[PDB]
Each structure stands twice: as structure tokens, then as C-alpha cells.
Amino acid sequence: MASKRALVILAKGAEEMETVIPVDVMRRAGIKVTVAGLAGKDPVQCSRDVVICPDASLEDAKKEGPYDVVVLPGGNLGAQNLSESAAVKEILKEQENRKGLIAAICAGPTALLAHEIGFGSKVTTHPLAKDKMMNGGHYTYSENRVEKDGLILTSRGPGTSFEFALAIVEALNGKEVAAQVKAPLVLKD
Amino acid sequence: MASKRALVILAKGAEEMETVIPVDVMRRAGIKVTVAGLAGKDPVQCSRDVVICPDASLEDAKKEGPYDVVVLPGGNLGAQNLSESAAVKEILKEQENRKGLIAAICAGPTALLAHEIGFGSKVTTHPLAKDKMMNGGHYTYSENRVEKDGLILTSRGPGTSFEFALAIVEALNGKEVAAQVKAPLVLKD
């Protein structure tokens, strides 16, 4: 069994907590994570001005698939950049076609709407992103902190990022690995 | 009233979640945060291989004090780098002498021990850093998720980082600002 692989797509204006918590937690789980810059190889200015250097450009990372999960951070402007990207559309449609997991948090799930991914699923988002996500009634809305309907895994905000990340770990590597990764984090529950 | 100012000292091997969560939450609170690279101006490879570009070198940022809080992220190797640094020693002793807040998380508080800061305080750390912190009995240990004894504010792990950050916000900008910053995060409590 080869290690699982995750693609985290990092755009200008991404929520840096929603980027770093899943990357770090997935690496703790032994997942090979590629932080891929939407715009290219250069550093990315996140929503609260943390600057992250991606591992690769998305252009290069997309040639090295497939991935066991594609992860979409939130941040209002980051999600808008993901939603406008033809490269993201192609990656998500390929992942959906191959029955691979797609995980999105906060405003991130609105890129699923933009790219017509996973219609008919139960989803959650940040409260403030609900109306955008629900435009057209293509999904059924959930208030769960993490929502998983098959291969569409969504979550609500910075404060649900650990739960989101651990749900990705459980989906890829199982409940026992998720529990082992969780304990050293000092989560409240 | 001018905005409060925070210095976050970023060393190789820092825990990236414990760096980014406080930076982001403090910026949401309107605090002017400087992410200062211990080693210089160049990007920093964190414990789980997230690469963060600092705002400034510590050498330059230290000339632009004083700061209302100095923040020490954890990560075992990052804290060891902070503990070995004469520049960090000088900054922490100046902050202590001026009765300014010092905040440290996970293994971060062990740099307080190394630099002889805040002896006689109640402190917490990550469970695995307790023995190092308690060598000599210079502090009294706490299992609270966040511990504040006057101007020494400590916390336990990645999963206490939001609580830690919000405690810094409350100390600097008050309980109402902390509550307002907290609500959009979708924390469980």
C-alpha cells in the first residue's frame, strides 16, 4: 500500500488557517500533501496576509495526479479565485469522474457550485456563504460542523478546520489513524 | 488610542498551526502583527514543511519595538531554536522589564525557561514538554488549556491555538473584541 496523496489548491485570498491546519494534520497522518499555487510557483498572499510558498504550481501539480483527495480551502476571495479557474474545473471534474474524494471548507464549497460538482449532495458552508452555495437549490444544506455525503466532504469555518482535517484522514487512512493523529493535538473534543 | 502591536518570532521547525492561528486571529482583532524570522528575512520551513515568508527579519523587527505582546509558537525544534537565541533572550528580558505580555504555546514556553523569564509563574505546556519546562521547579505546572499568570500567558497545543489567540486578544483589546472576533470562526465553544 502506497501512501495516500492530497492536492491542496492555494489561491490568493485563501484563509490561511484553513490551508495550514489541513496540510499539517494530513502530513501528521502520513499523507503526501502537495500545496499547489493556483497562479503559479510564487508565494501566495492569504486573506490575513500570511504569505505561504507553495510546493509547486497547480499547472505542474495537475500533471502528477491522480490524488486521493482534492482540498479546497476557504476565504471569500480565495474561493472566488478557485471558482473562476478553468484548471480547477478540470481537476474537480476528473476527481468526481474517478470517484475520488473532494473536500472543501467555509467558502470553499462555493467552488463546487461554480464547477457543477456534486449536485444533489448534502453540504455545509460558513453561515455567510450559505446563500451563494444554495443559489438554484442544487444541494441540500446542513448545519453540521463537518458534513460528508459520499465523496463530497464539507465544513464550516476556521474553527471546524481540525474536525475537517481529521475527517479527511479518517476517510483516507481509517478511524484508528485519525484517533492516533488527534491525541497529540490537545483538542477539546 | 493607537492599535496594539504583536511580535511573532518564527524559527525553523516552528509548528505552523501555532504560528498562523495566532497571527490570523490577532489581525482579525485589528492588532498590527509582525511575523519576524529568527534567522533573517528568508522563508521559514516549519515543522510539517509549510513554508512561511516572514514580514521582516527579527534583527530589523527588534529595532521597531516595543510591542504589546511577544508571541512564541511551539514545535519542538522551533522552540529549541528560540531557546538558543541571544536575540530572543534580549527581547524577552526587555518585554518582562517593561511589564509587557509574553505569550507562548506548546513547546514554546520552554524558551521562557531557557531565558530565565517569568519564574514563579503558573504555566502550562504541551504534555510532552512538561518535564523540560519543570526542570529545576522554577514554575508551577497547570493543566488548563490556556493559563495566564499576570503577564505570562501559556497554552498547550495546536488544538488550543484558537483559545490561546483569543486570550491574547482579550488581554490586549478586551473581552468584547475577543467575543466579536470569535463568533465568525465557528468554534465549538
* Greatest alpha-carbon span in chain A: 42
Which of A16, A53, A159 lies at the smallest CB-CB distance from B187?
Answer: A159
Q: Rounded CA gap, B97 and A102, in Å?
A: 51
Provide the shortest C-alpha distance from residue B189 to chain A (in Å): 9
CB contact under 8 A, A53 and B48: no
CB contact under 8 A, B51 and A52: yes
C-alpha cell at B182: 470569535
CA separation (Å) from B62 to A183, B34, B103? 36, 10, 17
Tell me which residues of chain A have a C-beta less than 8 Å from any C-beta of chain B: 15-17, 20-21, 23-24, 27-28, 35, 43, 47-53, 126-128, 145, 156-160, 162, 184-189
Q: Which domains does chain A have, with CATH numbers?
A: 2-188 (3.40.50.880)
Confirm whether A106 is a catalytic residue: yes
Q: Rounded CA gap, A83 and A125, in Å?
A: 15
* Euclidean distance between the first and the last CA atom of chain A, given in angstroms as a whole number: 31
Provide the shortest C-alpha distance from residue A158 to chain B (in Å): 5
Question: In chain B, which residue ranges form alpha helices assigned H by DSSP?
Answer: 16-28, 58-61, 76-83, 86-97, 110-114, 130-133, 161-173, 175-182
CB contact under 8 A, B186 and A51: no
Determine the Cα angle at A20 with ends B82 and B71, to 5°.
Answer: 30
CB contact under 8 A, A128 and B184: yes
C-alpha cell at B98: 517593561
Concatenating the DSSP letter of every residue in A15-54 gives -HHHHHHHHHHHHHTT-EEEEEETT-SS-EE-TTS-EEE-
Resolution (A): 1.0
Confirm whether B106 is a catalytic residue: yes
Which residues 6+ apart lie within 8 Å of B41 measured at CB?
Answer: B54, B56, B57, B60
Three-class HEC string of A106-139: CCCCHHHHHCCCCCCCEECCCHHHHHHHCCCCCC
Task: Indicate which technique resolved this structure.
Answer: X-ray
Q: Rounded CA gap, A95 and A101, in Å?
A: 7
Which residues 6+ apart lie within 8 Å of A32 measured at CB?
Answer: A3, A4, A5, A6
Q: β-strand A44-45 against A32-37: which pairing, if any?
A: unpaired
